[model samples]
Target: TQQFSILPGNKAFKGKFTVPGDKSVSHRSIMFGAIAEGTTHVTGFLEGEDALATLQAFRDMGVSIEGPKNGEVTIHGVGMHGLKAPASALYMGNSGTSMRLLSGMLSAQKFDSVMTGDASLSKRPMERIAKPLRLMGAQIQTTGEKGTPPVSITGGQQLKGIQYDLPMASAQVKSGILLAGLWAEGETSVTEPEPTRDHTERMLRAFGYDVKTEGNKISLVGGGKLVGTNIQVPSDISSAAFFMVGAAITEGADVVLEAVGINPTRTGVIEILKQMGADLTVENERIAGGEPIADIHIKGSRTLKGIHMPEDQVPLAIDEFPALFIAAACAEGQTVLTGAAELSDRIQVMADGLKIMGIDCTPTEDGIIIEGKGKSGDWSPIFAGGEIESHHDHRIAMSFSMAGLRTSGPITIHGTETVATSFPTFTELANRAGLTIEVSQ
Candidate 1:
């Protein structure tokens, strides 16, 4: 077991760093590449386990994939209807994205396949994907308790496309149905209850596929061919959240995060941070491979005010709430988060960890309410350092590390190896930005 000892900052953080490639884009790149007509080259591809799981799944289906060495990958497309059935089940390690997204693609294949994952991933709800894929005439079944993973898919059946209305806003489920739509008859459309990340749709367009987006609905016809294209994945904004919070809470801190993806659908963090009075800015804004990219500059030492987080931004900033919770702990007044029932369990875990460090946070069924003790307001040096458990969730681990920077003592986070599932170099880059963090085995 590995742990992270995060020391309180004595000085402001100042530096420029680039986080890993976007995990969502990385996964889609491999998927789009495998079914295209020509060879696809991807730069800045994330080598994290989650993305790698997608790459390996393609390899299992007889796709010739090479390199991911130093952020470069070459995928030789087998074209649509070219993949051969795998002899064994695909093993997705700690990646719910891999398992859910792949289920869509596999269901349309000419062969049967099974998808399994690590203990944590195995417990994640797969019925979200299963029901939709099944609705599209894909024979998919969840074999675990409460419709979790060990997802078994029987391929080779004729799939008829259908309009699916998601019970919730989930990118994975949306992406899965879209993938299955690629092989279905007629058109397949998905209507989300709220906006989720559109990386899959954007990546599909980049590969010469036509996806029509009208409001909350996204639709595409089946049997479309994709031409191999080059992809340059920007650094994940999710990974940049920790540093953004770190710089905001610490006194006199200034940090620049380079080439980060700021897709409007996923910019809830930026909106939420600015709402909390963070001195944050976007520079060199441009588009890369159909996604927005920019440099984020965060200046600290200013007073931060809290807000009752809006419901509209919940899905937009879903993945970022854990880090935003740390920012709330350092802001003045009280921060109430609602309309996040999608992450009720996650909020509880975060609140539990923060409470261990002497923060007053109430966990609600959907969100949490935190009483902020500003870094310089009222509760200066807000957090009292101590040991915290990460529950093997990568976001939880990294979020607390940022909380350490605003505390009076050192913070030790256990079960930190899970951080590699997304941001593998978090500690190294954090320390480079002047925060003290070390890994111990």
Candidate 2:
């Protein structure tokens, strides 16, 4: 276990920092690259534990993956059926992406397999993917009590495609079904209640596979082979979100985040911050690795006014809410957010931490309502320092770390070791960007 102590700050954060590569893009690159027919060169891969879990899983299944050293990786593509069954159960560490996505991919294999994960990963729901895969003729079983992990798959089921209308908007579930479609007979389609991150569809197309996307429905035919291509993953805007919120809330803070991925479905953080009157801008916009890239410039000492968070952008920026909650606490008015009643009570988890720091917040069933302290436009601290429990979520811990910039006392946060699952360099990057934070055992 680890705890982070962030000292109260009175200075501005200034500099240009490039956060790590997009985790979604990095994970998909390895997945598609391993199943393609040629060598795939990838640049700017996120080297965090979650992404690494995907890389290691491929290696254990008989793929030659080289050099994730310094954000560069070369994957030797093994055709769709080239994977060899490993001798032991594949351990996914603390990665839900690896577990959920791989369950679909492994379901179509010709060999039997079992996947296990850490306690945290084990607790996450896997029935969301399992139920759909089972409908597609996959012999998959979720042994967990609540249909979570400890998943076992009886491969060689001769999977057939099925059309599923997802009850929730989840890119992971959508991508899992689509990945299984790679080996199923006939076309597989999934329609989501709301649009989620489309990295899987985008990367599948990048690898020379055909995918059709119309509105909220995405479909792909089976038995198509993937061809390797060079992938240049942009920096993860998700990781850049902490600093974005930091610079936006702290007076005199002027910072530039470089080459971050701004995919349309993933720009909710940028949009929400702007809606709250954040002094932020998107600059030097361009495309990289089939994903949009831009320099996110954030300046502080501006009056930030809270607004109703759009429900349409909920899935688009779900991962960023941990950081977004901080922005809401410092805004000028009451922010009422709803339409995101997903997860193990994400709203309450954040709301619990906020109230502990003396921020007035209500944890609603759908979302959270917070009354901020920024109405006067004074650059005073909005957070009263106190202990915080991050629930072992990476984004949560990173979000609280930024409160130090606007905190009246030292902020201590626990369950920070989980930060390594996503943003491994969080402590260093935060300090370099002017947050006085230190992790202690």
Candidate 3:
């Protein structure tokens, strides 16, 4: 769809949907998978534009990638030491993950390369990446004064690994440093102030690379070969978070997100929601591809209460906050949140979109203050509002559209097409649930 006009649903939604694969994991599978020896098979891959961009980048580097056209991929790896620079600049479209992490990995390689992305990716700060990679002897240069994309990295330079204390709990940044450490002279370690998504660390080990983890600090020894293996990525829990909250707040029917990612590090949303008295069930718990997976079921509960959100769970549920906020807006009591300083520091832009919808939400020094006293039965703002911006962030756009189904109005997302960045079939699934969405100018 080019654009999306979101309207209110006549009745509460009742259905099961297999949301797209985890975007973060999808990106890593291509990067690390292509660098490993032998063929790596990955199922449940996200068919988003950003992930596809990574697949294409590997292809340009001469690594054979198959099953991409059918929403899966098989990478015939070239080994960490065997990777080659592409014939042209790697064009990473709208994926900050691809730009930063790949930048780090390429810096330690024996070739030279350049990376650029969409205008938005070009604007996102890269100094966080440049500073750490440079300390390891990487010759990295960014556009103008700001350390953004259009970056040139001189590979095969002298590099040394050091202890990096991250300023924020960003898994992407941490993963970038780890990628560079793979070729460094010594052990590369990073300590995060707050725990973040552990997909990189998990996938690294799944490839048989030895990575040591102590509390929030993770250290990886360099020069270890990441051999290819069969990777069965679990359904993205972040994508399922919206439905978890949606099912909790809707008027009827129970919502069960089947076999979603339940990695303890990523289950903060489930924990916080359950702590808030959300009617939830963690069923069919098991492990797959070195990450935990479980079927989460949530029934409509009118008695769902507001809570003082746990800051410790912020990183676990940060990506789901946008959707969680929607649940709070229509909940019974005031959901007080403190200690979410980490989320505000990185993604405060998300709050802006909700504010324009007349939401009683604003960011605080620690976290967001969401007055969960709004009614869920009516979604009127979306239908009458001319158009809303997505900021080209897939999660933000899709979360807003999903929230629209519960409102009393039809909402039009200006760049709903951006959903393809992570969940290409988001609209199609919504339609199957009896929701009407359309494209507009």
Candidate 4:
């Protein structure tokens, strides 16, 4: 077995890689599986630590989730109405995904439940989802003054659906309201200010629920039955991002990624890369469980220009930006991104992070600005080392790992274990792709 230590990389490298499954879809799979009717079979499910916490939570609620050792996950659905009041509080570990989504589902259950998470997750803002849930008549009280987690949710009451326009575009918020709408008394509708990932809405329809959308509005009827089915989760686009950036930065880098998801809502990173003139190809397109899939062929291109990205693309590229910014550092000119004010509010210290690595990057009120090292601009490696913090954010941890590989020295990030919340086996997978990775104690 491998122990913890820091990994090192610099200049140039090449290799094809496959990472773990999508974290967003994995959490929803388990939650939807437990509530759908019949047995829900899921392959390529993420085996992340936080995802496992969700599994244990459902199990404690008397929901059966089998296949603990590998990628095959089976959830025997007991219907949304099937869940009983749990014997204890549901612990979400470090996953905001579990806590938020479960909060919605639990709001309609016949029994009251309390949900909590690790310290990092507890500090996260849950009020975004809770306010709307409370509007639907779910009694939720958070531990702290500002309505963070360690939330107490009382169930068993009939909920009346209301139209909620999200103040922010977040997949978590959208999914939370929709899940609570499952047992609500009227039509539940949520309007996104911008397009967030639609995995929850897609999965609901895949499980035989009708979710209609009009422009910015997504509405569903309450009391509809969800039938369980086999789910082949497409490879995550978010995890594919690191490899994409890695290939872009190295000279003569040629790699093909297979069975990767390219859902338009989640492919903003690809769009931004291509706009910057990276030589990448999306091939062999197909569908898997209501989502699109494709093989990605990328060849390192010496010519890359700065791109003025669109505001609407922010939510789509939210998690992919950190590593994408790494690629930006190697591009030509100023790769300025704007109108993404939400990026400034994220928990991870991404702006401070790149500067620590000596990358030409800065954070603005909207988004980030990067001056790339134009093609063939010979550069000395920046010594990037410090005991960084992941903020218990998976993307932040993974991004630091990428930076570490490309730095002059080593980089250590405390709270690196949170990578399990999204991409489990991140370190091992990066190693397989010919990168040196280690964790420090």
Candidate 5:
């Protein structure tokens, strides 16, 4: 694994930078394109390991693919029911999205297939997807302990649609069930207790398939064909979270994140930060490929105030909490987050790192409570830096890297290569934005 050494109290960050294409969008693009008719062209595709894993899986199933060079990819789609059997298990490479989402599609194929991944991916639970797909008359079994990976699916079996209510708010699970629903005989509906990212639903509509959304429910009928179309994926908001928090905690910083997807379902970070009194603005609002896109202008604020984080925004900002935690540390008073158990383990990693850096933090069963040390117009380091472990989670690595912007001492982050899994150009983008981040051997 790669390591990063970040110096404390960086100068104010200032720049216009575009993050890589959305990881979720990039994955869905390949999945939808491969199963659609005609050739599909994709621009701004993220070449990260996770998205590439999805691309490679489709290639193994006999889709003709090209490029992904210079943020471009072309897929000669083979339409629904056109996939062939792979000779070996699909290697998902630390991507739960690729594995879980593909499980749904693969279970309906006319070929038997096995899906596996790296050590970290191998440990993530797959039973949630398995249970629902099984209810659709798809045969899938987790060959690992505690419903972990090495999931095997016997395809060519008849499938029927079923109504599935998600126990938790997860876009991946919803996307998986919807993907499987594409091959079932009837309507497949999924209801979530909270709103999750709807990229899958939107992208499916973009591909000429029909999907209905009403309140907390989303449903689609099976056996509809998808038509390939050109897609220009917007820059990932998750990638923007790191820099947004970086600027928020660093005094005098003015940063513009260009062409980021501000999809309402995925803007929890922006909403939470603004609620915390971060000076942020949305500019150049528009729509691209059925998703919301915008440029965000953010200026550092020393007087950021905390709040009892609204539970409703948790699903929207779920992936961004680690970075928000750093913002919490630099704010006035305390920040309490609840109804976010989906990220309890990941949040604990951030909390542990904050405590090591001399911040007061309390880890909870479902969330975290942070006592903000408060920054002044001038750099007042809240956390005294120390070596932190990322626990092989990419968000944890990047969050602490942002912490370096407000720390009193240098911070070292271990196992940072995982950052490449989602945001491969993080270091380059961060440095260009005026933060000092160095990869160590």
Candidate 6:
């Protein structure tokens, strides 16, 4: 197990910079670029393990790709019906997005394929994606305990489009179905109960594919060829979430994050924090590749008031919960998060970890609650540092690392090796903004 020690962040976080390109968008660039016809150019791509896994998977399918060196890649697309089968089971590393979305695209291929992943991913349930793909006449199978990884899909089966009502607002599952729709026999549609990230829908239009959105229903017809084009991935707000929370909770802390993607579907973290009374603002807003981008300014010296986390924001900021939970702990009065639970049960994990560090928090069936002990709304310097087990989840590890900002003692977190998948430069970037994180075995 990998381990790290975080010293108390005794000073303010002051800096102006950008983090990695959006991981979700970067993943789609490789996927869309590989499947589109012509030469596709992508800049500002994330060079993280998860995105790299998607790139390599396309390479294994005989797509010629170049550079990803300093966030640039040229994909010589194979077009629709162009990918060759791999020699062995594709390895997805720790990315559920890769596994789930690839399953949809792979199901439409003429060749059969299998996907395997690391231990953490192996435990993630794949049935949500498999069930919908199967409904579209895909011959897919999920093995392991409780429909986990090691997903086996038998190809050479023609897929017919179907309308799927999403049981939950999940971008990965929604994207998977849409990717498969590109090659289905007819019009495919999906009705989302609530809004999820629409990157898949936006990127489809960029590649010259027509996707119709009517309220909650998104529909697309089969047999549309994607024309390759240039894509500029914006800075990932998810990766910058730690800094946003850090700068907001620690007094005297001020920082400006540059050109982060503020896709309406992806800004729940900023919304939730603003509702909690953080001094935050957006500046120089623009759009790139059909996605929104902007610079975010957050400064400390105000107390964050706890409020009931609106359920509508759950899917939008789902990926940022681990860090948001930390913000809730450093809030005045009580903070409540309900209507967001998952197979990972991050709600329980974070609640338990905070309790170990002497915070007054309680974990519920669907969410968690944290009682802030701050006087006059000073939320920082409220945490009592202790050991934390991150369960090898990348976001969880990075979230706990930020808790040191408001802690009284050094925080030691285990199972931090998975940080490479999303935020590889976490330690270096955190240090640049005034935090001390020492790594160890």
lDDT of 5: 0.89
Q: 375 in model 1: Cα distance from truth in Å?
A: 6.5
TM-score of 6: 0.90
**In terms of TM-score, how similar is model 1 to the real structure?**
0.92
lDDT order, best first, reads: 5, 2, 1, 6, 4, 3
Give a tens-digit lDDT track for model 5, residues 1-441. 679998876466889989889977887888899989999999988876667788889899999999889989999999997898998999998889889899899999999999999999878999889999999999899965689989999988988999988998788899999999999999999999867788899999989999999889999999999999999898999999999998888888889999999999899999999999889999999987777899999998556887899888998898999999999999888999999987838877888899999999999988999999984554678889999999878999999988888788989999888787678889888888777788975
Candidate 6 lDDT, tens digit per residue, 260-318? 99998889999999999999999999988778999999998687888999888888898
Question: Which candidate's lDDT is highest?
Answer: 5
Worst 10 residues of 2 by lDDT: 340-349
lDDT of 6 at 383: 76
RMSD of each: 2.5, 2.4, 3.6, 3.5, 2.4, 2.7
lDDT (10s digit) by residue, model 3, range 1-441: 467776565546557777777767777788789999898998888766667778878788888878765556888998988776799999998888888888788899788999988878888989988898898889999987787889898876967888999887688889999999999989999999977778899999988999999998999988889989988778888878877776766666466677798888888889888887778898888877678888888877554567888877876787777777766766666787787665623336556666666666668887777666544343322222335676666666776676665566557776665666556666776676555667665
Clashes of 3: 13
Worst 10-residue lDDT window, candidate 4: 1-10
Candidate 1, residues 319-357, lDDT tens digits: the string is 999999999998988999998887937898898889989
Candidate 4 structure quality by residue, lDDT tens digits, 222-317: 989999999888888998898887777666667788889888889988888888788899999998777788988877655557778766677778
lDDT of candidate 1? 0.88
Provide backbone clash counts, one per model.
0, 0, 13, 2, 0, 0
Task: Compute the lDDT for candidate 4.
Answer: 0.78
How does model 6 fare in lDDT?
0.87
The worst-scoring run of ten residues by lDDT in candidate 6 lies at 372-381
TM-score of 3: 0.86
Q: Model 5, residue 352: what's the lDDT?
A: 89
What overall lDDT, based on C-alpha atoms, would model 2 receive against the true structure? 0.88
> Which residue pairs collide, candidate 5?
none
The per-model lDDT (C-alpha) reads 0.88, 0.88, 0.76, 0.78, 0.89, 0.87
Task: In angstroms, give how far residue 124 of model 4 lies from its true place.
Answer: 4.7
